[PDB]
Coordinates of C-alpha atoms and ligand atoms in Angstrom, one line a residue:
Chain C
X147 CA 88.2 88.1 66.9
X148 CA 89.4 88.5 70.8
X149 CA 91.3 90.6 72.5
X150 CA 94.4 90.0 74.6
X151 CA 95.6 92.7 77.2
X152 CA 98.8 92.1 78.8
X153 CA 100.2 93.9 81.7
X154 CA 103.6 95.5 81.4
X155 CA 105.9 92.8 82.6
X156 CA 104.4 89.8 81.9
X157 CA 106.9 88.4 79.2
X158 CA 106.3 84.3 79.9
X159 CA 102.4 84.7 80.0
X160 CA 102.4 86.3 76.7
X161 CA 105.3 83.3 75.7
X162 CA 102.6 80.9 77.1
X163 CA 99.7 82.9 75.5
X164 CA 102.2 82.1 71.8
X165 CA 102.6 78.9 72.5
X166 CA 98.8 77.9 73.0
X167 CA 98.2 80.3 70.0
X168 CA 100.4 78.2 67.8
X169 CA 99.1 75.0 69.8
X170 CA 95.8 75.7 69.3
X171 CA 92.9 86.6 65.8
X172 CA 94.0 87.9 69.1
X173 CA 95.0 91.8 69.5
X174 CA 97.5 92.3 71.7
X175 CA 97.8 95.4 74.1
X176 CA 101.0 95.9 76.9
X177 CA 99.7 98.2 79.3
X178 CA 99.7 99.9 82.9
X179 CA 97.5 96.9 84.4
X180 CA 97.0 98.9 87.7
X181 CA 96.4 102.0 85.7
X182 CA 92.2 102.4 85.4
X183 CA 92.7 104.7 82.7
X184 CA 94.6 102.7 80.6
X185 CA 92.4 99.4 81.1
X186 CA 89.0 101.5 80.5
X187 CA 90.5 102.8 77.2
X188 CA 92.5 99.5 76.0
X189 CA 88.7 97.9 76.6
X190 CA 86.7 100.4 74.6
X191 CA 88.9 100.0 71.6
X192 CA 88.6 96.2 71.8
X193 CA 85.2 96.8 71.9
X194 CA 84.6 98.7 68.8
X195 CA 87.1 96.7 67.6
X196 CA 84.3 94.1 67.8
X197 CA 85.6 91.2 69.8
X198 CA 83.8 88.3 71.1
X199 CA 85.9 87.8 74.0
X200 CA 88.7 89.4 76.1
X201 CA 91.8 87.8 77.8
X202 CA 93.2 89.6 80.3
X203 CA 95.2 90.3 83.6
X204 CA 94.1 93.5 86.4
X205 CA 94.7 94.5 89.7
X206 CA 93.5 95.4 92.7
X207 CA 92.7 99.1 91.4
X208 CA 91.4 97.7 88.2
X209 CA 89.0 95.2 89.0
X210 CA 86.1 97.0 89.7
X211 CA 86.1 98.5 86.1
X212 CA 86.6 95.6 84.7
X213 CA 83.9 93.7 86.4
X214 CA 81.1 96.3 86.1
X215 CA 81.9 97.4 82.4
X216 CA 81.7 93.3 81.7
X217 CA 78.6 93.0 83.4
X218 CA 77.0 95.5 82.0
X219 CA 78.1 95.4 78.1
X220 CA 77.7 91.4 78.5
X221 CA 81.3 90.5 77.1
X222 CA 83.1 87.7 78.6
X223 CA 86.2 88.3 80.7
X224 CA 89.1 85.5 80.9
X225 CA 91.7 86.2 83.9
X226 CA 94.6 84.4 85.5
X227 CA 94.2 86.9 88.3
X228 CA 92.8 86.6 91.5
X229 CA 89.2 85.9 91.9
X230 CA 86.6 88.4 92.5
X231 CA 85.1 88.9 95.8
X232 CA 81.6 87.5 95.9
X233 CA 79.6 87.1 92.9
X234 CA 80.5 88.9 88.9
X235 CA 78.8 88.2 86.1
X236 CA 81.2 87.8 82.8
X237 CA 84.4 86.5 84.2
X238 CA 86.4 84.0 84.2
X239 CA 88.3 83.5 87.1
X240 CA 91.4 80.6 85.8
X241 CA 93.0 80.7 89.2
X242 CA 91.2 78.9 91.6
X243 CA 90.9 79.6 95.3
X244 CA 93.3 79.3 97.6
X245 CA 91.7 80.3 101.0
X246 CA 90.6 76.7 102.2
X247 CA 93.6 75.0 101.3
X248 CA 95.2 77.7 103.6
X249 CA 93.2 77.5 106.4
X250 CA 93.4 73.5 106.2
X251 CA 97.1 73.6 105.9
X252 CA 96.9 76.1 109.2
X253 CA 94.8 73.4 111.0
X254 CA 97.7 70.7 110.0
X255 CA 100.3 72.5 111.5
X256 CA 97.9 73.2 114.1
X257 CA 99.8 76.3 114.8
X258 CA 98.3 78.4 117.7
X259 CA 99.6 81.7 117.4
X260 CA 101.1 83.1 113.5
X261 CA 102.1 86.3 111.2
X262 CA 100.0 86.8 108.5
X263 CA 101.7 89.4 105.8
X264 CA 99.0 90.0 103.2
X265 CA 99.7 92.3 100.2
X266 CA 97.0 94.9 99.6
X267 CA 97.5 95.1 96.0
X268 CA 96.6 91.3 95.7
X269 CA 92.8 92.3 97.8
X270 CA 92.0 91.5 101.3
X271 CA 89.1 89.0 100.6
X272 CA 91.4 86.0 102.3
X273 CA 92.1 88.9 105.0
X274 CA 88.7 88.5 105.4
X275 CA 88.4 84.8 105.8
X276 CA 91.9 83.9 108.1
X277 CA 90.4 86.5 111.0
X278 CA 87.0 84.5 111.2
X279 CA 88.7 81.0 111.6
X280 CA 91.3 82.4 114.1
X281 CA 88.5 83.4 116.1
X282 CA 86.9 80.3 116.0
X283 CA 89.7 78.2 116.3
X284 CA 91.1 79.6 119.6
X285 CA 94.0 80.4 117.4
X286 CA 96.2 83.6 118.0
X287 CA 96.8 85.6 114.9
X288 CA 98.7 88.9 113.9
X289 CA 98.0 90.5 110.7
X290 CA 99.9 93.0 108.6
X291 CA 99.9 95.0 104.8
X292 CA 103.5 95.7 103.5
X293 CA 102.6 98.0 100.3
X294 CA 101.2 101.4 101.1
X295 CA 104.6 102.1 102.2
X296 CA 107.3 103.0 100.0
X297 CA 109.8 101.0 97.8
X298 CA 113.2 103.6 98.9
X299 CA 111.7 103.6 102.8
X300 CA 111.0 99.2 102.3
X301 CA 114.4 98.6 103.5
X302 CA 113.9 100.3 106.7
X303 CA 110.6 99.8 107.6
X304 CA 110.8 95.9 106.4
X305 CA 113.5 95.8 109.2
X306 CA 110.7 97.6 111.5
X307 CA 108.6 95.2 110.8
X308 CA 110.7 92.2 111.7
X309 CA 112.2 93.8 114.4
X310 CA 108.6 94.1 115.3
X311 CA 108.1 90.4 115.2
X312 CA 110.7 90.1 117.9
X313 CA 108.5 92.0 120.6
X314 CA 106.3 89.2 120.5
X315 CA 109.3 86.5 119.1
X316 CA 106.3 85.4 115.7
X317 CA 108.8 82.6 114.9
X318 CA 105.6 81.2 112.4
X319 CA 104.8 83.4 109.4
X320 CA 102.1 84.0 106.3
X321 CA 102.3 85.7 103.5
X322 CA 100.1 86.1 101.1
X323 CA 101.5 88.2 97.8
X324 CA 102.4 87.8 94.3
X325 CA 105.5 85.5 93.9
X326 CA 108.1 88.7 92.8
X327 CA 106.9 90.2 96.6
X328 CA 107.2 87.2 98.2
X329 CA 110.9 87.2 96.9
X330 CA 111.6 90.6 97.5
X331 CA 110.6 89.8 101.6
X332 CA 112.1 86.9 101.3
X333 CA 115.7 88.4 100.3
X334 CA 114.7 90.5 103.4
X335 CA 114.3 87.8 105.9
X336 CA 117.7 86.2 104.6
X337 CA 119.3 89.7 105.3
X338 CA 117.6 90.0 109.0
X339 CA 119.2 86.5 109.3
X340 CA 115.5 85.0 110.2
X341 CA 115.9 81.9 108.0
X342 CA 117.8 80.1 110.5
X343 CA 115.8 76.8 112.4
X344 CA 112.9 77.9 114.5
X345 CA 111.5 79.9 112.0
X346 CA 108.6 78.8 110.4
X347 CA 106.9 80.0 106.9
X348 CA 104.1 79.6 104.9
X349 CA 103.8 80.9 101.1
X350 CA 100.3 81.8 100.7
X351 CA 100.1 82.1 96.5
X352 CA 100.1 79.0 94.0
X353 CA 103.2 79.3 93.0
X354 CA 105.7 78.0 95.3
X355 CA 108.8 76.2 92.8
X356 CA 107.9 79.5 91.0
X357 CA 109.9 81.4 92.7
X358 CA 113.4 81.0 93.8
X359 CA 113.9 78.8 96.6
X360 CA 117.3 77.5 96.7
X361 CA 118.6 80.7 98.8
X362 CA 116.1 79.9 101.7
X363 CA 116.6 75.9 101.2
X364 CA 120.0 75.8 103.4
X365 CA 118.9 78.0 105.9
X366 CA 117.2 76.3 108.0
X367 CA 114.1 77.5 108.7
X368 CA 111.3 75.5 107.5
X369 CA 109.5 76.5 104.2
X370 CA 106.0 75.3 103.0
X371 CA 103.5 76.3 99.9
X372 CA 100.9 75.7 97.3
X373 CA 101.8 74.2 93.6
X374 CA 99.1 74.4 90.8
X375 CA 101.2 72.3 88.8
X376 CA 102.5 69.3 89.2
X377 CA 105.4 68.4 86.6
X378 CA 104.6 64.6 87.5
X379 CA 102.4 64.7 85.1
X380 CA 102.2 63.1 81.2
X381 CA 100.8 66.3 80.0
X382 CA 102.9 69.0 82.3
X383 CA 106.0 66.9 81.2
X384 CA 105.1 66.8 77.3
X385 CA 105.0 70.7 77.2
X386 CA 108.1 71.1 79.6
X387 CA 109.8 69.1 76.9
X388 CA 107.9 71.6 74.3
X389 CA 109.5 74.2 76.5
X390 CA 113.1 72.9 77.3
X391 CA 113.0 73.1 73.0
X392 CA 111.8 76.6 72.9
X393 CA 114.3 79.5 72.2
X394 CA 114.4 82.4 74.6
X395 CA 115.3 84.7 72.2
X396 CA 111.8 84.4 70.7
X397 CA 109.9 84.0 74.2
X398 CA 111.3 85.4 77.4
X399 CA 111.9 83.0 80.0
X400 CA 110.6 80.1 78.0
X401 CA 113.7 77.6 77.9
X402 CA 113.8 77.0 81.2
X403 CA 112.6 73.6 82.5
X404 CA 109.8 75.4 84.9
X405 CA 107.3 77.5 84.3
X406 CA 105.6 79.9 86.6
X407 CA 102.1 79.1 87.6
X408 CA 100.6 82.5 85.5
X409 CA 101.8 81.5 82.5
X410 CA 100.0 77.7 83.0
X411 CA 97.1 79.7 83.8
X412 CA 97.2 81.7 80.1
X413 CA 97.9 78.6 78.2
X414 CA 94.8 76.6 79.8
X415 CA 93.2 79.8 79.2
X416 CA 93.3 80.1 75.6
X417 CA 92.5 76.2 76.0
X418 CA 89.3 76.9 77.2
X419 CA 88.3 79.6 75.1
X420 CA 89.2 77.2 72.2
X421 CA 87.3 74.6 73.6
X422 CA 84.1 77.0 74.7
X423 CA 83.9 78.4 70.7
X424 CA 84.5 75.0 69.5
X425 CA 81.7 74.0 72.0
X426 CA 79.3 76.7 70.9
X427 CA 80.0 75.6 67.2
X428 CA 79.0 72.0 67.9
X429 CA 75.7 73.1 69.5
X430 CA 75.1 75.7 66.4
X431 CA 74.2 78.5 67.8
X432 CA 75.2 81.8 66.4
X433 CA 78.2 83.7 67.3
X434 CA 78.7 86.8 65.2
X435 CA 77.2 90.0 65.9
X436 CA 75.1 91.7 63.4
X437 CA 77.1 95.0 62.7
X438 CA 79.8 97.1 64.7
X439 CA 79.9 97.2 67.8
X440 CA 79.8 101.1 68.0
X441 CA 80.8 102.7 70.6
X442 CA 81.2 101.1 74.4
X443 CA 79.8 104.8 75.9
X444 CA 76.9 104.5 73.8
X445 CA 74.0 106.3 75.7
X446 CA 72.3 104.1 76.7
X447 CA 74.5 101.6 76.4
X448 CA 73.5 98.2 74.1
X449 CA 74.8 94.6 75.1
X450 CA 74.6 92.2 72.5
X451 CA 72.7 89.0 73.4
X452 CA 74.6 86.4 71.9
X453 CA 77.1 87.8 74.6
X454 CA 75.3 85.9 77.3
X455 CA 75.7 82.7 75.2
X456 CA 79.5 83.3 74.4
X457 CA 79.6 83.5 78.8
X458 CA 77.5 80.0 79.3
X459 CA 79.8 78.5 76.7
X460 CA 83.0 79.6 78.5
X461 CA 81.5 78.3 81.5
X462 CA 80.0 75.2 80.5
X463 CA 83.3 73.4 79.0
X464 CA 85.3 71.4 80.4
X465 CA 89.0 70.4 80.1
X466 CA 92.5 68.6 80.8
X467 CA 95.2 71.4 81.4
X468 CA 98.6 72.3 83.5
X469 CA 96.4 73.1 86.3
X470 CA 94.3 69.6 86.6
X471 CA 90.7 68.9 86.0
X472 CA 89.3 72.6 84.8
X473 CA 85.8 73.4 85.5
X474 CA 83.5 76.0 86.0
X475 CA 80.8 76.7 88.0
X476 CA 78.0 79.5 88.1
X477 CA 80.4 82.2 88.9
X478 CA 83.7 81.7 87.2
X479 CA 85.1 79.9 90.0
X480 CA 87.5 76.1 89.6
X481 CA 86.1 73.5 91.1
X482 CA 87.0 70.2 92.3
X483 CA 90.7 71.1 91.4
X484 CA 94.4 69.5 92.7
X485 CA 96.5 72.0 94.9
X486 CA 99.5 70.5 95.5
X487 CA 100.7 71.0 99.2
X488 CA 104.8 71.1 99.3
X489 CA 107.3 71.2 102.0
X490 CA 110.5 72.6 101.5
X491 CA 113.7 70.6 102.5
X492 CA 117.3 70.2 102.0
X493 CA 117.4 67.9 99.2
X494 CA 115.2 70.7 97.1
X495 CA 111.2 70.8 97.2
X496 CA 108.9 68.2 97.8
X497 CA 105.1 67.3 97.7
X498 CA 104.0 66.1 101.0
X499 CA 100.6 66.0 99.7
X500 CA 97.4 67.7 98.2
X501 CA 94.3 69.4 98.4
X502 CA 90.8 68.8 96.6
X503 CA 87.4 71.0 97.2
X504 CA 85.3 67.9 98.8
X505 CA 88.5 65.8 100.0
X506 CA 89.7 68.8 102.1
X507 CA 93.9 68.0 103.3
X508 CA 94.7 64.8 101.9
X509 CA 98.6 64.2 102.9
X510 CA 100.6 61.2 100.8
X511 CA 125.0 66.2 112.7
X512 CA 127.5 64.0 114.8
Chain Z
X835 CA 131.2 84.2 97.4
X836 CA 132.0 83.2 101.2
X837 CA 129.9 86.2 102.2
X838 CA 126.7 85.0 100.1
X839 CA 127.4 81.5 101.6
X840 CA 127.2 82.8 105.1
X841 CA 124.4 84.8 104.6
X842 CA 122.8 81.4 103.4
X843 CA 123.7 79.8 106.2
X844 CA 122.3 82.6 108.2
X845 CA 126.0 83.3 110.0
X846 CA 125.4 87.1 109.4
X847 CA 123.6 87.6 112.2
X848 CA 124.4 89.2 115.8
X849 CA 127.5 88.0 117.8
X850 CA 129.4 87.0 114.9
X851 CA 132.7 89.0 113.9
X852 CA 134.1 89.2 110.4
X853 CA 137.8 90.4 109.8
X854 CA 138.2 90.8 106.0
X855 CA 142.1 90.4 105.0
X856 CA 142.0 92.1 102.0
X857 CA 142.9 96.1 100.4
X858 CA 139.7 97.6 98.9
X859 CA 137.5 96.4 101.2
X860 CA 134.4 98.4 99.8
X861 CA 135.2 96.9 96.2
X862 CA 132.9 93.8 97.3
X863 CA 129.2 94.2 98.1
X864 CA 128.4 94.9 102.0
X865 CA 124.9 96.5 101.3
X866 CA 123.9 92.7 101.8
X867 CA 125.4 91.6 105.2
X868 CA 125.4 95.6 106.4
X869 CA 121.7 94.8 107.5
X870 CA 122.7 91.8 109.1
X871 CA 124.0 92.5 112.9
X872 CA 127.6 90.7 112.6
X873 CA 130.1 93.3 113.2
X874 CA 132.2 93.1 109.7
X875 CA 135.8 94.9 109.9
X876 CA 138.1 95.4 107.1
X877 CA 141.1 97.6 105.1
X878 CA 140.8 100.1 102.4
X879 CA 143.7 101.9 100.9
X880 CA 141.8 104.6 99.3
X881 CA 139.5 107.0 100.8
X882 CA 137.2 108.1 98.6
Chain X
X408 CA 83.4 107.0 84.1
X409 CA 80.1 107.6 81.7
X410 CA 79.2 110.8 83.9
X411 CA 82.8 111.7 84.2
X412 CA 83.4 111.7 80.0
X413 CA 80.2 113.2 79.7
X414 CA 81.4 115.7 82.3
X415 CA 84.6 116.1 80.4
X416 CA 83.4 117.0 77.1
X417 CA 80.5 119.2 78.4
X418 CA 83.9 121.3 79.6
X419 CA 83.9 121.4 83.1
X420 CA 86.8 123.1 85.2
X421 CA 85.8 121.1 88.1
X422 CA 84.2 118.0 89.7
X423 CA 82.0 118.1 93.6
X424 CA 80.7 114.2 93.5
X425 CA 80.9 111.3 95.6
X426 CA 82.3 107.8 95.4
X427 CA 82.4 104.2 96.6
X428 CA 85.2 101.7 97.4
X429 CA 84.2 99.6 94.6
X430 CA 84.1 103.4 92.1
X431 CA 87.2 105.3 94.4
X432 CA 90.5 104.0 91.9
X433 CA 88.5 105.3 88.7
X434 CA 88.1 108.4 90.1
X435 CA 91.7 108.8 90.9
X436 CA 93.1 107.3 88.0
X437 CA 91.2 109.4 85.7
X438 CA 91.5 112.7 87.3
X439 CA 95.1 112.2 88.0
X440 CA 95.3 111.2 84.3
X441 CA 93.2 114.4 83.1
X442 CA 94.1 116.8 85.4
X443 CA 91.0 117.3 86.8
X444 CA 90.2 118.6 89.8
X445 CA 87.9 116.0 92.3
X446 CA 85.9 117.4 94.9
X447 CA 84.3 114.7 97.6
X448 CA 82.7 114.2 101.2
X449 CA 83.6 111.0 101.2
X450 CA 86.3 109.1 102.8
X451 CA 89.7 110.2 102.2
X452 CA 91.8 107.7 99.4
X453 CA 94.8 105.7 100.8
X454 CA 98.4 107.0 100.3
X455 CA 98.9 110.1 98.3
X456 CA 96.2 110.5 94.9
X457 CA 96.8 113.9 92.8
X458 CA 93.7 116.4 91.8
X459 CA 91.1 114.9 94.9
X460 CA 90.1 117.1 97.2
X461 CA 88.8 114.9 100.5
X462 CA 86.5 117.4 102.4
X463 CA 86.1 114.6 105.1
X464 CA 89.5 114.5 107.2
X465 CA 91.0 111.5 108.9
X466 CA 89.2 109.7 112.2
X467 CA 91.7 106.6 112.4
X468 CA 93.2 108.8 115.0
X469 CA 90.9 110.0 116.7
X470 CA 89.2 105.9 117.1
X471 CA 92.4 105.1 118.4
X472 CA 93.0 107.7 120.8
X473 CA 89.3 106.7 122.2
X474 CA 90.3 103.6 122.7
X475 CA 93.2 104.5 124.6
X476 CA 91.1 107.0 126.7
X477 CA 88.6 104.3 127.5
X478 CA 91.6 102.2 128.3
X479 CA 89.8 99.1 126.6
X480 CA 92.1 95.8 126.5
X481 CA 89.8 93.5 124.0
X482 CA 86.8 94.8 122.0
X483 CA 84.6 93.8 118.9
X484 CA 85.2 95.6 115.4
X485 CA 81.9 95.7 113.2
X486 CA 83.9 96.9 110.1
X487 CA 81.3 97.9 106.5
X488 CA 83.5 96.5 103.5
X489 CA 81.8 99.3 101.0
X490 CA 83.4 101.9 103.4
X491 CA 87.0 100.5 102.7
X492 CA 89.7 98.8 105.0
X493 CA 91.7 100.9 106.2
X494 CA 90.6 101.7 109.6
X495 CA 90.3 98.2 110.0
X496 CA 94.0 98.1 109.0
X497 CA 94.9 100.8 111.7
X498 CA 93.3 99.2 114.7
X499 CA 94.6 95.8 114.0
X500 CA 98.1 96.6 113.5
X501 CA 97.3 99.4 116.4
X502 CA 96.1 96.2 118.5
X503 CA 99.5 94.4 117.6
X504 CA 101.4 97.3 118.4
X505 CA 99.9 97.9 122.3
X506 CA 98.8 93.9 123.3
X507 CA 95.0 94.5 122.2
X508 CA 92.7 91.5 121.6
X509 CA 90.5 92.3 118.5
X510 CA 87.8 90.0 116.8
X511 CA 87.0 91.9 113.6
X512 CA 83.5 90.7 111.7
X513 CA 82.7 91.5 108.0
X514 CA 78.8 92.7 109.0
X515 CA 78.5 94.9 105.6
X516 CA 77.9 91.3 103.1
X517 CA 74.5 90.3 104.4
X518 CA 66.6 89.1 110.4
X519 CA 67.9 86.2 111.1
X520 CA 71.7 86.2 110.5
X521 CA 72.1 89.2 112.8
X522 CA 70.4 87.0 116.2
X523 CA 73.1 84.6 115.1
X524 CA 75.8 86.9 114.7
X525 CA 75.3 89.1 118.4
X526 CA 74.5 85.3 120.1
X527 CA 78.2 84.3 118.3
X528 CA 79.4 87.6 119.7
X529 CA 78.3 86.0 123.2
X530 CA 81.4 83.4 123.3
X531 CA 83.5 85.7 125.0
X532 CA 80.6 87.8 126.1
X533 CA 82.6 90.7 125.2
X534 CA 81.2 94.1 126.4
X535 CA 83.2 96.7 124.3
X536 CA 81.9 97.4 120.5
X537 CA 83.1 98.9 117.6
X538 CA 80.8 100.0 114.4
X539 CA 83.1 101.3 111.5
X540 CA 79.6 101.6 108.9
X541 CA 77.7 104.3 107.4
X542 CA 74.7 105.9 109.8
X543 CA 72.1 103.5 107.9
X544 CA 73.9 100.7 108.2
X545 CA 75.0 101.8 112.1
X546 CA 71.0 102.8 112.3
Ligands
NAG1366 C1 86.0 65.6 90.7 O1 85.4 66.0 89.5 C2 85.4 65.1 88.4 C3 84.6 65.8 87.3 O2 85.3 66.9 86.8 C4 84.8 63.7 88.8 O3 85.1 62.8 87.8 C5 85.4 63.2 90.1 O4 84.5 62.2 90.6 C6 85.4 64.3 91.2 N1 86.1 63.8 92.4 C7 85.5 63.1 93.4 C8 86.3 62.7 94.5 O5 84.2 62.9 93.4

């Protein structure tokens, strides 16, 4: 038994999620992911619902709950979501982190002055870090959040903001939001006309060919991200085959040839729970609890010890998925992973090189 | 389709002049160069 | 959200309590949700939350307008993450607005480290400081 919770939207994660099911008894739940509410109650009933472990997405609103109710009723946690800031016990952070591989690809541009856009809803931890090496650097940095402010009143003050950019002519941008923001301020920048040569941008989120870049690709300006996965690969290009066969009647958004980098992150997710159960089966230990769960209010509340052991597991195994080498260490965190560093020119995108944990940057009209 | 060309090209912006030749000028989309500085004109046979 | 449920079914027509940056989207979601009424000194939430009452008002302003009385063109912002961003958020775009040199420190995610952190402060041997922390952590 383990739970899957699945934010309202997410249609090719859950087509990934089916397709490393069938790969490879989840209860599904589509809710308000941003909503704490929601999430607090969807967890309690997984709970007494007596699951070993819970797959799931949250947000910047929701990850608190998440992270304290997991730490404190010792079930394990499994998100494609951002990483927490600092050290949580319980969860499993699939995504790896970005922040180096940012700061590296700052210091091979070398820029000296830059825009950095960060989306509040996606948590200011990298915020946090991009300041601290400006300030060592020497480097000149201006930094702004584009989501308090309203979706009807975006137009407007998106054109405020740019215009804005102009009082100090920022021709070399950041930003650091989900891929569906990224595109929205994107389709802004081609209406301001700001795509044209001089301008200079860097996507900030893993998934770069993701996204839709063939109305920025003749514009001019120069374009450059991160790509978790790279379809030059045996495995990535055995389950794009899998996925050019799928219908999309049956899964949303699962005939095309790519595949966003969330979804990856599902599929390699149920991987690893598959693997981490299989794991704890070939050591023998024992997995089931001893009677229902009861309630997750309980006063005071009682974690089940073979909890911990279900976390080790999860954290201890090791495996081969879209993403590259996954592994674990004390915290939840990837290690020693591939990030794929891609320019963007006119004969579509193209990987100018990668980036590893101990290898740091490692690049490859008449 | 010209339009969404030009705004690829990024030929919507400021000091550029569009005369569109055709009646029902409003029947194609302008929310999407309106933002763009170039000065668009155009004819429109109805008024709404 | 134990105390609040407990709260809840105890019947309770109101709720005076206090929260944290990590605790503050609970609060809101669930007494948004419930239609309870939130009562707190602490600092006020971001944007526009239903059923919280925020006795503490807003100081963004007044911080700015300081720093335009004392005229300051470059200073030091000490900012406490468990007190939230969002002053932090107003001076820095603030400082892009008016030509303002800001180095902003996270000081709140600690003997030793702070004689490294003033003698790093020492680069510039900037003058001006800002502390943006609860008294004990200002103390
Ligand atoms: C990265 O990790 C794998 C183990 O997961 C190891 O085989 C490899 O040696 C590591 N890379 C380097 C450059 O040491």
């Amino acid at each position: 038994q383990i739970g899957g919770l699945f934010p309202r939207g997410a249609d090719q994660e859950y087509s990934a999620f089916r397709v490393g099911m069938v790969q490879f008894t989840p209860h599904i739940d589509n809710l308000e992911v941003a909503n704490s509410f929601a999430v607090t109650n969807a967890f309690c009933s997984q709970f007494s619902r007596g699951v070993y472990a819970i797959f799931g997405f949250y947000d910047k609103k929701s990850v608190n709950t998440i992270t304290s109710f997991c730490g404190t009723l010792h079930v394990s946690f499994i998100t494609p979501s951002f990483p927490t800031d600092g050290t949580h016990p319980f969860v499993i952070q699939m995504r790896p982190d970005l922040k180096g591989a940012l700061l590296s690809l700052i210091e091979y541009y070398q820029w000296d002055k830059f825009a950095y856009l960060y989306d509040s809803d996606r948590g200011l931890s990298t915020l946090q870090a991009v300041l601290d090496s400006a300030a060592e650097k020497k480097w000149q940095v201006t930094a702004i959040n584009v989501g308090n402010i309203n979706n009807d009143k975006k137009d407007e003050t998106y054109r405020s903001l740019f215009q804005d950019l102009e009082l100090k002519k920022e021709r070399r941008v950041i930003l650091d939001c989900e891929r569906d923001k990224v595109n929205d301020i994107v389709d802004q920048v081609i209406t301001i006309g700001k795509h044209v040569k001089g301008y200079h941008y860097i996507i900030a989120n893993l998934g770069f060919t993701d996204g839709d870049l063939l109305k920025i690709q003749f514009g001019g300006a120069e374009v450059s991200g991160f790509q978790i996965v790279d379809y030059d690969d045996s495995l990535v290009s055995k389950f794009i085959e899998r996925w050019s066969t799928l219908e999309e009647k049956e899964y949303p958004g699962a005939h095309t040839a790519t595949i966003k980098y969330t979804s990856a992150l599902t599929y390699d997710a149920v991987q690893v729970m598959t693997e981490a159960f299989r794991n704890l089966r070939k050591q023998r230990i024992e997995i089931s609890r001893r009677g229902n769960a009861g309630d997750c209010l309980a006063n005071p509340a009682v974690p089940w010890g073979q909890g911990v052991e279900i976390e080790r597991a999860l954290k201890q195994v090791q495996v081969e998925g879209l993403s590259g080498n996954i592994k674990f260490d004390q915290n939840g965190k990837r290690i020693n992973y591939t990030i794929n560093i891609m320019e963007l020119k006119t004969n579509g995108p193209r990987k100018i090189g990668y980036w590893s944990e101990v290898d740091k940057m490692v690049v490859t009209q008449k």
